[PDB]
Protein backbone atom coordinates (compact mmCIF):
# COMPACT_ATOMS: atom_id res chain seq x y z
CA UNK A 1 0.00 0.00 0.00
CA UNK A 2 1.61 3.40 -0.82
CA UNK A 3 1.26 5.83 2.21
CA UNK A 4 -1.04 8.88 1.95
CA UNK A 5 -0.66 11.87 3.77
CA UNK A 6 -3.61 12.67 6.17
CA UNK A 7 -3.84 15.76 8.70
CA UNK A 8 -1.95 16.07 11.70
CA UNK A 9 1.08 14.48 10.23
CA UNK A 10 4.19 16.82 9.67
CA UNK A 11 5.84 17.18 6.43
CA UNK A 12 8.30 19.36 4.80
CA UNK A 13 7.66 21.50 1.10
CA UNK A 14 10.72 20.26 -1.08
CA UNK A 15 11.51 22.27 -4.71
CA UNK A 16 14.60 21.21 -6.91
CA UNK A 17 16.60 23.32 -8.35
CA UNK A 18 19.25 23.16 -11.22
CA UNK A 19 22.56 25.16 -10.22
CA UNK A 20 25.80 24.45 -12.01
CA UNK A 21 24.06 21.39 -13.84
CA UNK A 22 23.83 20.00 -10.23
CA UNK A 23 20.43 19.65 -8.73
CA UNK A 24 19.91 20.99 -5.34
CA UNK A 25 16.87 20.19 -2.82
CA UNK A 26 15.17 22.80 -0.99
CA UNK A 27 13.11 22.71 2.08
CA UNK A 28 10.88 26.08 2.39
CA UNK A 29 11.84 27.32 6.01
CA UNK A 30 10.75 30.16 7.94
CA UNK A 31 12.30 31.73 11.70
CA UNK A 32 8.96 32.35 12.76
CA UNK A 33 9.38 35.41 15.72
CA UNK A 34 11.50 38.30 14.41
CA UNK A 35 11.13 37.13 10.79
CA UNK A 36 7.96 36.17 8.80
CA UNK A 37 9.40 35.46 5.34
CA UNK A 38 10.09 32.49 4.16
CA UNK A 39 13.18 31.29 2.41
CA UNK A 40 14.92 28.05 1.61
CA UNK A 41 17.39 25.76 3.52
CA UNK A 42 19.39 23.72 1.14
CA UNK A 43 19.06 19.99 2.28
CA UNK A 44 21.02 18.74 -0.71
CA UNK A 45 24.60 18.80 0.88
CA UNK A 46 23.40 17.08 4.17
CA UNK A 47 26.26 14.76 4.38
CA UNK A 48 28.82 17.57 4.59
CA UNK A 49 26.47 19.99 6.27
CA UNK A 50 23.55 19.37 8.23
CA UNK A 51 20.27 21.07 7.55
CA UNK A 52 18.28 23.10 10.10
CA UNK A 53 15.03 20.81 9.70
CA UNK A 54 13.39 22.58 13.07
CA UNK A 55 12.21 25.65 11.09
CA UNK A 56 11.54 23.59 7.77
CA UNK A 57 8.67 21.38 9.79
CA UNK A 58 5.21 21.74 9.48
CA UNK A 59 1.69 20.72 10.06
CA UNK A 60 -1.12 19.95 7.78
CA UNK A 61 -3.68 21.64 10.61
CA UNK A 62 -6.72 21.11 8.19
CA UNK A 63 -7.88 19.87 4.69
CA UNK A 64 -11.08 21.26 3.72
CA UNK A 65 -12.78 21.18 0.50
CA UNK A 66 -13.32 24.43 -1.29
CA UNK A 67 -16.85 25.21 -1.02
CA UNK A 68 -16.40 23.27 2.61
CA UNK A 69 -13.42 26.16 3.39
CA UNK A 70 -16.05 28.78 2.08
CA UNK A 71 -18.45 27.75 4.58
CA UNK A 72 -15.87 28.27 7.25
CA UNK A 73 -14.54 31.12 6.43
CA UNK A 74 -18.49 32.39 6.34
CA UNK A 75 -19.25 31.10 9.68
CA UNK A 76 -7.31 12.66 10.27
CA UNK A 77 -8.95 12.86 6.84
CA UNK A 78 -6.57 11.63 4.03
CA UNK A 79 -5.64 15.00 1.63
CA UNK A 80 -7.30 15.07 -1.77
CA UNK A 81 -6.28 17.11 -4.90
CA UNK A 82 -8.15 19.75 -4.89
CA UNK A 83 -8.48 20.56 -0.68
CA UNK A 84 -7.57 23.70 0.64
CA UNK A 85 -4.89 22.85 3.47
CA UNK A 86 -3.81 24.51 6.38
CA UNK A 87 -0.15 24.46 7.61
CA UNK A 88 0.86 25.73 11.40
CA UNK A 89 4.86 25.88 11.64
CA UNK A 90 5.74 23.66 14.01
CA UNK A 91 7.99 25.85 16.09
CA UNK A 92 6.48 28.60 16.24
CA UNK A 93 2.96 27.91 15.89
CA UNK A 94 2.05 30.33 12.87
CA UNK A 95 0.46 29.60 9.64
CA UNK A 96 2.01 29.71 6.66
CA UNK A 97 0.15 32.43 4.48
CA UNK A 98 0.19 34.63 1.24
CA UNK A 99 1.57 38.04 2.47
CA UNK A 100 0.12 41.53 0.67
CA UNK A 101 3.58 42.96 0.49
CA UNK A 102 6.00 42.35 -2.03
CA UNK A 103 10.14 42.71 -1.80
CA UNK A 104 10.83 41.03 -5.57
CA UNK A 105 12.42 43.43 -7.73
CA UNK A 106 11.96 40.63 -10.90
CA UNK A 107 8.45 40.38 -10.47
CA UNK A 108 6.03 43.37 -10.17
CA UNK A 109 3.19 40.48 -9.50
CA UNK A 110 4.60 38.23 -7.03
CA UNK A 111 3.82 38.62 -3.45
CA UNK A 112 6.23 37.36 -0.38
CA UNK A 113 5.32 34.10 1.23
CA UNK A 114 5.71 34.36 4.58
CA UNK A 115 4.12 33.06 8.57
CA UNK A 116 1.08 34.32 10.12
CA UNK A 117 0.17 34.79 13.65
CA UNK A 118 -3.83 34.07 13.22
CA UNK A 119 -4.98 31.08 10.93
CA UNK A 120 -8.31 33.48 10.44
CA UNK A 121 -8.81 34.47 6.85
CA UNK A 122 -8.13 33.49 3.18
CA UNK A 123 -4.12 33.78 3.12
CA UNK A 124 -3.54 30.83 5.68
CA UNK A 125 -5.21 28.70 3.38
CA UNK A 126 -3.37 26.64 0.37
CA UNK A 127 -5.18 24.40 -2.28
CA UNK A 128 -3.13 21.45 -4.06
CA UNK A 129 -3.48 20.07 -7.51
CA UNK A 130 -1.94 17.45 -9.12
CA UNK A 131 1.72 18.45 -11.24
CA UNK A 132 1.25 15.98 -13.70
CA UNK A 133 -1.88 14.70 -15.45
CA UNK A 134 -1.27 10.99 -14.22
CA UNK A 135 -2.48 12.37 -10.90
CA UNK A 136 -6.10 13.19 -11.02
CA UNK A 137 -8.12 15.97 -9.35
CA UNK A 138 -10.22 14.31 -6.31
CA UNK A 139 -7.77 11.18 -6.07
CA UNK A 140 -5.70 11.21 -2.76
CA UNK A 141 -2.36 12.22 -2.32
CA UNK A 142 0.23 9.72 -2.09
CA UNK A 143 3.71 10.29 -0.25
CA UNK A 144 6.03 11.55 -2.88
CA UNK A 145 3.97 13.31 -5.43
CA UNK A 146 4.87 16.47 -7.39
CA UNK A 147 2.31 19.14 -6.66
CA UNK A 148 1.40 22.60 -6.92
CA UNK A 149 0.30 24.96 -4.54
CA UNK A 150 -2.21 28.16 -5.21
CA UNK A 151 -2.92 30.50 -2.76
CA UNK A 152 -6.57 30.79 -1.99
CA UNK A 153 -6.58 34.49 -1.53
CA UNK A 154 -4.11 35.53 -4.14
CA UNK A 155 -4.55 32.72 -6.88
CA UNK A 156 -0.66 32.97 -7.21
CA UNK A 157 1.24 29.85 -6.99
CA UNK A 158 3.91 29.11 -4.72
CA UNK A 159 6.96 29.86 -6.93
CA UNK A 160 10.42 29.27 -6.66
CA UNK A 161 12.42 32.37 -8.42
CA UNK A 162 15.83 32.23 -9.75
CA UNK A 163 15.77 35.69 -11.48
CA UNK A 164 17.86 36.84 -8.33
CA UNK A 165 21.00 35.01 -8.37
CA UNK A 166 20.16 34.02 -4.53
CA UNK A 167 17.37 31.52 -4.91
CA UNK A 168 13.84 32.96 -3.31
CA UNK A 169 10.44 32.15 -2.71
CA UNK A 170 7.59 33.97 -3.58
CA UNK A 171 3.90 33.85 -4.19
CA UNK A 172 3.42 34.52 -8.70
CA UNK A 173 1.89 33.61 -11.46
CA UNK A 174 4.42 31.42 -12.46
CA UNK A 175 4.30 27.73 -11.02
CA UNK A 176 6.92 25.46 -9.58
CA UNK A 177 6.74 21.71 -8.40
CA UNK A 178 6.63 20.54 -4.64
CA UNK A 179 6.97 17.71 -2.99
CA UNK A 180 6.05 17.19 0.62
CA UNK A 181 7.82 14.49 2.26
CA UNK A 182 6.26 13.37 5.77
CA UNK A 183 8.47 13.98 8.84
CA UNK A 184 5.96 12.01 10.88
CA UNK A 185 2.62 10.45 11.17
CA UNK A 186 1.73 8.92 14.19
CA UNK A 187 3.91 8.18 16.91
CA UNK A 188 2.97 5.67 19.49
CA UNK A 189 3.28 7.09 23.05
CA UNK A 190 6.28 6.96 25.10
CA UNK A 191 8.85 6.06 22.37
CA UNK A 192 11.56 8.33 21.35
CA UNK A 193 11.54 9.70 17.58
CA UNK A 194 13.93 11.55 16.14
CA UNK A 195 13.54 15.50 15.72
CA UNK A 196 12.48 15.45 19.37
CA UNK A 197 14.42 18.20 21.88
CA UNK A 198 15.22 16.06 25.00
CA UNK A 199 17.60 15.70 27.94
CA UNK A 200 20.26 12.61 27.99
CA UNK A 201 20.52 11.85 31.90
CA UNK A 202 23.29 10.03 32.85
CA UNK A 203 20.93 6.95 33.93
CA UNK A 204 19.07 8.11 36.73
CA UNK A 205 21.61 9.81 38.33
CA UNK A 206 19.65 13.24 37.89
CA UNK A 207 23.02 14.19 35.85
CA UNK A 208 22.10 15.25 32.65
CA UNK A 209 24.94 15.96 29.72
CA UNK A 210 25.38 19.39 28.76
CA UNK A 211 27.55 22.33 27.77
CA UNK A 212 29.38 24.97 30.28
CA UNK A 213 27.50 27.98 31.51
CA UNK A 214 27.52 31.13 29.03
CA UNK A 215 30.54 33.22 29.00
CA UNK A 216 32.56 29.97 30.07
CA UNK A 217 36.24 30.44 29.14
CA UNK A 218 36.39 27.18 26.81
CA UNK A 219 33.80 28.84 24.47
CA UNK A 220 31.31 26.45 25.03
CA UNK B 1 -0.29 40.42 -32.20
CA UNK B 2 -1.57 43.73 -30.77
CA UNK B 3 -4.46 43.75 -33.36
CA UNK B 4 -5.92 40.56 -32.77
CA UNK B 5 -5.64 40.56 -28.55
CA UNK B 6 -7.47 44.23 -29.11
CA UNK B 7 -10.35 42.00 -30.95
CA UNK B 8 -10.24 39.17 -28.61
CA UNK B 9 -10.42 41.62 -25.94
CA UNK B 10 -13.38 43.62 -27.15
CA UNK B 11 -15.59 40.51 -27.30
CA UNK B 12 -14.58 39.73 -24.17
CA UNK B 13 -15.36 43.29 -22.61
CA UNK B 14 -19.07 42.63 -24.12
CA UNK B 15 -19.45 39.01 -22.18
CA UNK B 16 -18.20 40.74 -18.78
CA UNK B 17 -20.28 44.29 -19.11
CA UNK B 18 -24.06 44.09 -19.94
CA UNK B 19 -26.49 47.61 -19.86
CA UNK B 20 -23.75 49.30 -17.60
CA UNK B 21 -23.52 46.27 -14.86
CA UNK B 22 -21.07 44.01 -14.08
CA UNK B 23 -21.48 40.57 -14.76
CA UNK B 24 -19.81 38.65 -11.62
CA UNK B 25 -20.26 34.96 -13.23
CA UNK B 26 -18.22 35.94 -16.31
CA UNK B 27 -16.44 38.53 -14.96
CA UNK B 28 -14.57 36.24 -12.38
CA UNK B 29 -14.43 33.56 -14.85
CA UNK B 30 -12.49 35.64 -16.97
CA UNK B 31 -9.89 37.17 -14.57
CA UNK B 32 -9.08 33.83 -13.33
CA UNK B 33 -8.35 32.82 -17.16
CA UNK B 34 -6.46 36.18 -17.74
CA UNK B 35 -3.96 35.40 -14.70
CA UNK B 36 -3.45 31.67 -15.61
CA UNK B 37 -2.46 32.78 -18.97
CA UNK B 38 -0.03 35.86 -18.54
CA UNK B 39 1.05 36.44 -22.16
CA UNK B 40 -2.92 37.79 -22.59
CA UNK B 41 -1.52 40.96 -20.42
CA UNK B 42 1.05 41.44 -22.97
CA UNK B 43 5.01 41.24 -23.24
CA UNK B 44 4.99 44.85 -20.49
CA UNK B 45 2.56 43.23 -18.05
CA UNK B 46 4.48 40.27 -17.47
CA UNK B 47 5.87 39.88 -14.10
CA UNK B 48 9.76 38.51 -15.29
CA UNK B 49 10.48 41.24 -17.43
CA UNK C 1 -17.11 4.01 -9.81
CA UNK C 2 -15.34 6.85 -11.30
CA UNK C 3 -18.40 8.21 -12.28
CA UNK C 4 -19.83 7.80 -8.62
CA UNK C 5 -17.60 9.15 -7.54
CA UNK C 6 -17.18 12.37 -9.45
CA UNK C 7 -21.43 12.48 -8.26
CA UNK C 8 -20.48 11.94 -4.77
CA UNK C 9 -18.31 15.39 -4.52
CA UNK C 10 -20.68 17.26 -7.12
CA UNK C 11 -23.52 16.51 -3.98
CA UNK C 12 -21.01 17.01 -1.51
CA UNK C 13 -20.24 20.35 -2.84
CA UNK C 14 -23.93 21.20 -3.68
CA UNK C 15 -24.83 20.03 0.34
CA UNK C 16 -22.16 22.70 1.37
CA UNK C 17 -23.65 25.63 -0.79
CA UNK C 18 -26.75 25.32 1.48
CA UNK C 19 -25.36 24.15 4.45
CA UNK C 20 -25.25 27.81 6.04
CA UNK C 21 -29.28 28.95 4.29
CA UNK C 22 -32.00 27.49 6.75
CA UNK C 23 -34.65 25.89 4.37
CA UNK C 24 -33.73 24.67 1.09
CA UNK C 25 -35.28 26.60 -1.97
CA UNK C 26 -37.44 24.72 -4.54
CA UNK C 27 -35.40 24.62 -7.21
CA UNK C 28 -32.60 23.36 -5.03
CA UNK C 29 -34.69 20.56 -4.19
CA UNK C 30 -35.55 19.85 -7.92
CA UNK C 31 -32.14 19.25 -8.67
CA UNK C 32 -30.80 17.21 -5.49
CA UNK C 33 -33.73 14.85 -6.65
CA UNK C 34 -31.98 14.67 -10.14
CA UNK C 35 -28.89 14.11 -8.68
CA UNK C 36 -30.45 11.57 -6.12
CA UNK C 37 -32.33 9.63 -8.77
CA UNK C 38 -29.04 9.53 -11.03
CA UNK C 39 -27.46 7.94 -7.97
CA UNK C 40 -30.04 5.72 -7.24
CA UNK C 41 -29.57 4.50 -10.55
CA UNK C 42 -25.64 4.05 -10.22
CA UNK C 43 -26.07 2.30 -7.09
CA UNK C 44 -28.23 -0.51 -8.53
CA UNK C 45 -26.08 -0.73 -11.65
CA UNK C 46 -23.01 -1.24 -9.34
CA UNK C 47 -25.53 -3.84 -7.22
CA UNK C 48 -26.59 -5.90 -10.39
CA UNK D 1 4.17 -8.99 -17.05
CA UNK D 2 0.85 -8.65 -17.99
CA UNK D 3 -0.17 -6.04 -21.02
CA UNK D 4 -1.79 -2.54 -19.85
CA UNK D 5 -2.14 -3.58 -16.33
CA UNK D 6 1.14 -3.75 -15.47
CA UNK D 7 3.42 -0.21 -15.18
CA UNK D 8 7.16 -1.18 -15.82
CA UNK D 9 10.19 1.27 -15.31
CA UNK D 10 12.54 0.75 -18.04
CA UNK D 11 15.90 0.56 -16.76
CA UNK D 12 19.69 0.14 -18.79
CA UNK D 13 21.58 -2.39 -17.80
CA UNK D 14 25.14 -1.83 -17.64
CA UNK D 15 24.63 1.70 -17.19
CA UNK D 16 21.77 1.39 -14.57
CA UNK D 17 20.16 4.67 -15.85
CA UNK D 18 16.30 5.02 -15.82
CA UNK D 19 14.95 5.92 -19.09
CA UNK D 20 12.64 9.30 -18.52
CA UNK D 21 11.60 12.19 -20.28
CA UNK D 22 13.87 15.33 -20.51
CA UNK D 23 12.72 18.45 -18.59
CA UNK D 24 10.87 20.68 -21.44
CA UNK D 25 13.20 22.90 -23.77
CA UNK D 26 12.54 26.33 -23.15
CA UNK D 27 10.21 28.35 -25.93
CA UNK D 28 8.56 25.08 -25.94
CA UNK D 29 5.46 26.44 -24.99
CA UNK D 30 5.77 28.33 -28.50
CA UNK D 31 6.81 25.27 -30.28
CA UNK D 32 3.24 24.22 -29.08
CA UNK D 33 4.41 20.68 -29.35
CA UNK D 34 4.09 17.98 -26.80
CA UNK D 35 7.15 16.09 -27.99
CA UNK D 36 9.22 15.35 -25.14
CA UNK D 37 13.01 14.07 -25.57
CA UNK D 38 13.19 10.75 -24.17
CA UNK D 39 17.17 10.26 -21.87
CA UNK D 40 18.74 7.85 -19.46
CA UNK D 41 18.98 9.80 -16.34
CA UNK D 42 20.09 7.90 -12.58
CA UNK D 43 17.43 9.49 -11.19
CA UNK D 44 14.35 9.85 -13.13
CA UNK D 45 10.84 10.96 -12.52
CA UNK D 46 7.58 9.34 -10.27
CA UNK D 47 5.84 9.03 -13.71
CA UNK D 48 8.52 7.54 -15.81
CA UNK D 49 6.55 4.27 -15.58
CA UNK E 1 -1.95 48.96 -32.03
CA UNK E 2 0.24 48.80 -28.97
CA UNK E 3 -2.09 51.60 -27.48
CA UNK E 4 -4.98 50.25 -28.39
CA UNK E 5 -4.71 46.66 -27.18
CA UNK E 6 -3.31 48.43 -23.88
CA UNK E 7 -6.25 49.97 -23.89
CA UNK E 8 -8.79 47.61 -24.65
CA UNK E 9 -6.92 45.34 -21.89
CA UNK E 10 -7.55 47.73 -18.87
CA UNK E 11 -11.06 48.64 -20.05
CA UNK E 12 -12.04 44.63 -19.80
CA UNK E 13 -10.55 44.45 -16.71
CA UNK E 14 -12.23 47.65 -15.67
CA UNK E 15 -15.26 46.04 -16.45
CA UNK E 16 -14.69 42.93 -14.97
CA UNK E 17 -14.36 45.07 -11.43
CA UNK E 18 -17.45 44.21 -9.12
CA UNK E 19 -19.85 46.54 -8.64
CA UNK E 20 -19.67 48.76 -5.28
CA UNK E 21 -23.25 47.66 -3.79
CA UNK E 22 -21.75 44.05 -3.43
CA UNK E 23 -18.51 45.19 -2.10
CA UNK E 24 -20.35 46.99 0.17
CA UNK E 25 -22.32 43.97 0.89
CA UNK E 26 -18.31 42.58 1.68
CA UNK E 27 -18.68 39.46 -0.64
CA UNK E 28 -15.35 37.62 -0.54
CA UNK E 29 -15.13 36.63 -4.28
CA UNK E 30 -15.87 40.28 -5.31
CA UNK E 31 -13.13 41.56 -2.61
CA UNK E 32 -9.92 39.17 -3.91
CA UNK E 33 -11.32 40.28 -7.27
CA UNK E 34 -10.75 43.89 -6.27
CA UNK E 35 -7.55 42.91 -4.93
CA UNK E 36 -6.35 41.01 -7.67
CA UNK E 37 -7.25 44.03 -10.14
CA UNK E 38 -5.57 46.32 -7.98
CA UNK E 39 -2.28 43.96 -8.12
CA UNK E 40 -2.21 43.94 -11.99
CA UNK E 41 -2.55 47.10 -12.60
CA UNK E 42 -0.95 50.26 -9.62
CA UNK E 43 -2.62 53.22 -9.58
CA UNK E 44 0.72 55.54 -10.78
CA UNK E 45 1.04 53.62 -13.93
CA UNK E 46 -3.31 55.22 -14.05
CA UNK E 47 -2.64 58.15 -13.16
CA UNK E 48 1.03 58.71 -14.98
CA UNK E 49 -0.88 57.58 -18.72
Known amino acids: EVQFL ?84 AHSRMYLSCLTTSRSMTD ?15 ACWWTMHPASKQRSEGEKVRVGDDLILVSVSSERYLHLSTASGELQVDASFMQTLWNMNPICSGCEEGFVTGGHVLRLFHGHMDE ?9 DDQR | NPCGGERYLDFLRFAVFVNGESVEENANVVVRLLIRKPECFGPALRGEG | VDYLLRLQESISDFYWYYSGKDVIEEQGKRNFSKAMSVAKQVFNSLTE | IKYGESLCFVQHVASGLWLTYAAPDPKALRLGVLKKKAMLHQEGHMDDA | AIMSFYAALIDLLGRCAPETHLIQAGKGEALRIRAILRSLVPLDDLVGI
Open chain 1, 6 to 89: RTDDEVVLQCSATVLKEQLKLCLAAEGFGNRLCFLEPTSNAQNVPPDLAICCFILEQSLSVRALQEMLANHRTLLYGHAILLRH
Open chain 1, 108 to 122: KLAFDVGLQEDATGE
Open chain 1, 208 to 216: CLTISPSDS
